[PDB]
Amino acid sequence: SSVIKPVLKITNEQQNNLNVHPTGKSINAIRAFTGKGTLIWGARTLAGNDNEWRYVSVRRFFNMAEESIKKGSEPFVFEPNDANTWTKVKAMIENFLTLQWRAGALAGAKPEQAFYVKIGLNETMTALDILEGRMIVEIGMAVVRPAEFIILKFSHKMQ
Amino acid sequence: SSVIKPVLKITNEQQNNLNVHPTGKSINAIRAFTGKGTLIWGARTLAGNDNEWRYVSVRRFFNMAEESIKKGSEPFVFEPNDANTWTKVKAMIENFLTLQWRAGALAGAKPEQAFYVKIGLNETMTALDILEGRMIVEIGMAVVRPAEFIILKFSHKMQ
Amino acid sequence: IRTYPPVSFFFEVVFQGENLDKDVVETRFQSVTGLSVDMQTETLKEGGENRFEHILPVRTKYDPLVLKRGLVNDSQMVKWCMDAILNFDIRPMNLLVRLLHIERSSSTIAPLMTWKVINAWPKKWSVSEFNAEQNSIAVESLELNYSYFETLK
Amino acid sequence: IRTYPPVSFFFEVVFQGENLDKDVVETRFQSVTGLSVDMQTETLKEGGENRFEHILPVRTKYDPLVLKRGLVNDSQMVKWCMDAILNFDIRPMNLLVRLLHIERSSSTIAPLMTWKVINAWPKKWSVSEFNAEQNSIAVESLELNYSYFETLK
Amino acid sequence: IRTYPPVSFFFEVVFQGENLDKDVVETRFQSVTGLSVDMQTETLKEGGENRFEHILPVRTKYDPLVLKRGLVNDSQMVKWCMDAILNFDIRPMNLLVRLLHIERSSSTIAPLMTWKVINAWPKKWSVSEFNAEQNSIAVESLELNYSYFETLK
Amino acid sequence: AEYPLPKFHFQVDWGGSRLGFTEVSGLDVETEVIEYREGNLPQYHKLKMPGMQKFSNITMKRGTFQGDNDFYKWWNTVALNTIERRDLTISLLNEKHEPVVVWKVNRAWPTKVQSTDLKGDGNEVAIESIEVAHEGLTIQNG
Amino acid sequence: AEYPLPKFHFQVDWGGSRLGFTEVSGLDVETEVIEYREGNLPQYHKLKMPGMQKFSNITMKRGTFQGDNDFYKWWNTVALNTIERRDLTISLLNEKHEPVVVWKVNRAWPTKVQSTDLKGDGNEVAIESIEVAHEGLTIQNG
Amino acid sequence: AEYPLPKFHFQVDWGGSRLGFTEVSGLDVETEVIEYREGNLPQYHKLKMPGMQKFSNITMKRGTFQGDNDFYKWWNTVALNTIERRDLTISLLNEKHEPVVVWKVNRAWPTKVQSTDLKGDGNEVAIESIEVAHEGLTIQNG
């Protein structure tokens, strides 16, 4: 909004070396399209060769989820380190991730296909961590990734 | 318009080697006709022996259709690579080609005889392709071609 | 032997004229009518024959041709008509009227019936009323004179 | 190439006259009609040719122009008309008739079609019936003669 | 500048005559019509000018004035009319026709428009059909000739 | 969020002493459709194009209290073709008693006023109602 | 198989921010009938033959959320006879959240927008609705 | 015997892949009546005489399964005034799964195809329907 024009014009042959490069240091481009205006083209991070963290949206989603889980878990500090607190925190985390699955952010037809949360003695914690005041929770989450190139095949049909 | 005259006069015996030639490098002619003025005569490309791309109008039509399909499809970049986006893009393409059939540009008495559009897993795309971000659509179109020669035959009718 | 009659709403008009046969907007009409012929006669009575009289042929008359469209703001045809009407300069033309159908042997659009209309020139031109309180389309109507029409057998 | 035809209910009338082109109430009308032209001809029969007769052009005729409004109690236009009618003193004027549309390239109101009407002068004036038992508006109607009309190409 | 047009059902008629202007029942009417004027012309063709013809003014014509009421069994006006009709003794009068509105500056009834009708005299008188099987009112109708009408400016 | 809103908390500004009503209806916008077809179209159904607009009347109800005769006064403001015209504003509120959706009505004036029915065994209150004409309406959400 | 499908899991693509709706109707295709008979037919009833086609309008409902005013915006896109036209796609899904039956609608544009009713004792949400005109529709099963 | 038959066991042959339907109606035959009287008849009421015949349309319903799009295909067989026409046979069976009453329909072709409605809370299946025109019908019992 409130934009007249980019100062430089970038073509496809130039963006070929801006989006994919041996170093992984991707650069996103602002380009004008006819009848549309000035658009943001490219959504890749500075780690563009990383099989997990190529895309901006995946990392932003992971940051949001992690901070909200952190806020939800904070009220349990200074509690007795026993099975009851483990159960409480596990229930909180599963409820949050279920609400997130319902919104369409996680992949899968059922909650059991989207995430898992685990805590327990000799499962995630050794007694050493328990006695000294630590809790260990293991969380896994399934996400989806975007498509960037759309291709077409044109042909003639027998009359 | 605003033309007095061609600098050279071209006859039929000379255009015989300008319109059809073993190399395919056709040359179109500007000729004066009595009572009509100066007309453009010939509508063939530099690939005059190609069974598909002889005529200028066919290639210009294909270019127009391809660029408009491109513009229509651009808003779907960066979308999730799933069946819903495939459905969305397929519907857009069929609607455009239907509007073009209605105008008289495509051959056939019904839309099903003029074009076809296809997309799907193990139909146009493969599994691995999904993992990278690519969509493949197959489109076929039927067109018509002009007539160049008119032959008249005369005889004596019996009284 | 026929079992079902043809349909009237699929039709076309072609102007075999100055260069109007290649202009797409010059073939699209909302309505076409006026294709009818009439024989005019006189009556003669013979004395002594009281059972009937004699009807004798005299001449032949044709109806004007009427076309209706939505208003086209720049038309070569209307330039031709207004040149005839304002500057008293007429140049008659030939026309074709076609009734179309679907033929298949896949399918194709083909003419079913064709009439040739000979020596047409402008007769009347009109546009519909403008009214601030109605939902309507600006519709223009043209009427033409001609000599006769024939079937393209 | 056109796909949709124009609409008839957005229009305007302009009087290129004494000083009426700047008066706002003189451009607002409920209805305008009468814009049509007709060619009148005669028929000639040639002996020996029994297939058709000859139609020969004679003259051109135009329809009167009709305007309808709600009654305006003080109008300069009506003073002009009543000066023509009561004191047999006529002074013809020129008119424009416009059909309007919305153009955008944001948007603006612009003329779509324009006709020039040459040498108009009063023909008839009327007001509708007064009736104690009906819900109605006092409506006045004016009819004008003119020489011809042309398209502002 | 006007935004809303006037209403037609609030009106009055006044007879400026023998002594009828003070009689209350002589101002109450169910319907009044006939207030329209027309210019009659002739057509002249000039040789060599094929684009238009000349319209020349000739004379002016006015419509009769028509009044409708429920039947009044004793009317001085009807005595005036029947004296004209039975004894061939006519004495023309002047009339006013008023269109009324509410003005406030509290409120008051005031004239909005006024026409003067000059030299009126009887033309026709009628009463509606009597029918044993219908719910109806006896309605009388009067038609008058006059010379002309003018606006009371 | 993921939860919709209710219809049991609103307010009407109409130029009276009381802003409370029991029923509010007639909020609607409509447009006309014009159909067209030429003879040689490979399509046998008609084409559509927008036309003129149309707005409906507004109906509002309220209970009857002692000392309140505003509906009749506004209706009786009428003269031959003149009447007092007003700007009518209807709003939707949330839980902090603030607006959320606003309907704006230009140049409203009443066309019908309907009084109550009386029944001896009736264990119900006295309900009066009004119907309002207006040129155009608008919708503001957010 | 031997079991039919339900109607409680679908999706609509219309060019807005939300794909969820509460009601979808007006999916129908019709054709006209022409009758004919000649005088000497050993049959006394008329013969039938296909005519022109006709499509109905589309009606869709939705609950009202805060900050969403797409229906009014699309309706208000109208100009004298012009308006933004869209391609409308309605689908039916299965248990893996994939499509099964698709309705394709060409050149849709809205003709009516109806807002909610307000009742004080009402324990129901606010429902808005739209009606859509469109040239032609198609059906794809499989 | 002394016991009547039920209406819950039948079959339809229409040229499709499935012979099962949920509803069958529109089986009816009608004739017109012409009235006449002369002046001196000792009878003051009119005389009656048979006229022309009239048949009604046929309506059939079915549930929606995956991979079955026959109704739309048959409807879409239409051309300007031509279409594929079929012979329709409807039967009534007994307990050994054999026919008992047969309706024979000549030269049927579809005139309307109506798709389903979608409701989120709906605990009902998806029902499509068709309406069929046809020249004449016949009844065979026994």
Amino acid at H95: E
Query: Is the Cβ–Cβ distance between F4 and G64 less than 8 Å?
Result: yes
Under DSSP, the state recorded for B157 is P
What is the C-alpha to C-alpha distance for residues B124 and F113, in angstroms, rounded to an integer?
A: 68
d(CA F49, CA C79): 28
Q: How many CA atoms lie within 13 A of F80 on its CB side?
A: 21
A149 chain-B contacts, CB cut-off 8 A? 133-135
Q: Report the Cα A126 to chain-centroid distance in Å.
A: 30
Contact C148 D52 (CB under 8 A): yes
Phi/psi of residue H98, nearest 5 degrees: -120, 155
* Resolution expressed in Å: 3.2
Query: Per this entry, what is the length of chain F?
Result: 142
Q: How many CB pairs under 8 A join E and F?
A: 10
Residue type, E69: R
Q: Are the C-beta atoms of H131 and G47 separated by less than 8 Å?
A: no
> Rounded distance, CA B82 to CA F120, Å?
68
Interface with chain D: mutation pick from E2, E62, E152, highest number of D CBs within 10 Å: E2
Instruction: In whole angstroms, give the CA distance from residue G103 to residue D95.
Output: 54
**C4 and G36: CB-CB below 8 Å?**
yes
What is the rounded distance in angstroms from the CA atom of residue A82 to the CA atom of residue A130? 8
Q: Which residue has the tokens 């529109």?
A: H26
Q: Tell me if G127 sits within 8 A of G63, measured CB to CB.
A: yes
Place of tokens 């001809």: D41
Residues 6+ apart with CB under 8 A from C55: C41, C42, C43, C44
User: Cα–Cα distance between F23 and F7 in angstroms, integer?
Assistant: 11
Is residue H112 within 8 A of residue H130, CB to CB? The reply is yes
Q: Hey, which chains touch E, using 3+ CB pairs under 8 Å?
A: C, D, F
Element (H, E) at B156: none
Angstrom distance (rounded) from CA H131 to CA E125: 66
Q: Residue E29: helix, strand or coil by DSSP?
A: coil
Closest listed residue to residue F24, CA positions, set F129, F141, F138: F129
With touching defined as 3 or more inter-chain CB pairs under 8 Å, the answer for chains F and B is: yes
CA distance readout (Å), F85 to A77, F2, F73, F78: 65, 41, 13, 10
- Phi, psi torsion values for B128, nearest 5 degrees: -55, -40
Provide the 3-class DSSP secondary structure of residue B113.
Answer: helix
Give the number of other Cβ atoms within 10 Å of residue E97's Cβ.
Answer: 20
Nearest partner of G111 among C136, F33, D5, F28, judged by Cα:
F33
| Cβ-Cβ contacts under 8 Å for B71 (sequence gap 6 or more) | A35
Three-state secondary structure call for residue H135: coil
Asked if residue F55 lies in contact with residue F135, where contact means CB atoms within 8 angstroms, the answer is yes
Measured between alpha carbons, how far is E69 from G121 in angstroms, rounded to an integer?
57
Residues of chain G contacting residue H119, judged by C-beta atoms under 8 Å apart: 7-8, 22-23
- Quickly list DSSP for C84-133: HHHS-----EEEEEEEEEEEE--EEEEEEEEEEEEEEEEEEEEEPPEETT
**What are residue A34's DSSP bridge partners?**
none
Quickly count helices (H) and strands (E) in chain C. Answer: 1, 10
SS3 state of residue B56: helix
Q: Which residues pair with C124 in a beta bridge?
A: C143, D38
Q: Per the CB < 8 Å rule, is H112 touching G23?
A: no
User: Which of the residues G13, G95, G100, G101 would you substitute to probe the B interface, choosing the one with the greatest number of B C-beta atoms within 10 Å?
Assistant: G13
Of A76, H15, G76, B64, residue with least CA distance to F137:
G76
Cβ D4–G81 below 8 Å, yes or no? yes
Cβ of E29 and D132 within 8 Å?
Answer: yes
How far lies E73's CA from each of E67, E141, H115, in Å? 16, 14, 73
- Does the beta-carbon distance from D99 to C134 stay under 8 Å? no
C-alpha distances in angstroms, G140 versus A59, E151, F16?
38, 73, 57
Q: Indicate the DSSP class of residue B49.
A: T
- Picking from E3, E9, E33 by the largest number of D CB atoms within 10 A of its own CB, the best residue to mutate is E9
The SS3 assignment for G75 reads helix
Name which of C24, C124, C132 is nearest D9 (Cβ-Cβ).
Answer: C132
Query: Chain A contact for B35, CB < 8 A?
Result: no
Read off the amino acid at residue A28.
N
Across the interface, whether the CB atoms of E10 and F82 are under 8 A apart is answered: no
Chain A neighbors of G95, CB-CB under 8 A: 109
User: Using the beta-carbon criterion (under 8 Å), do G87 and B95 form an inter-chain contact?
Assistant: yes
Sequence letter at residue H89: T
What would the two tokens of residue H40 be? Answer: 């001196």
Residue in the structure block whose two tokens are 């499935």: H18
Length of chain E: 153
Q: What share of chain B is helix, strand, coil (3-state, %, to 5)?
A: 35, 15, 45
* C-alpha distances in Å from residue E130, one per residue of D111, E30, E31, E137, H39: 59, 19, 20, 9, 34
Q: Is G84 on the interface with D (CB under 8 A)?
A: no
Strands (E), chain H: 10-13, 23-25, 29-36, 47-55, 58-63, 86-93, 99-114, 118-119, 127-133, 137-141
Tokens 């919305």 label which residue? D102
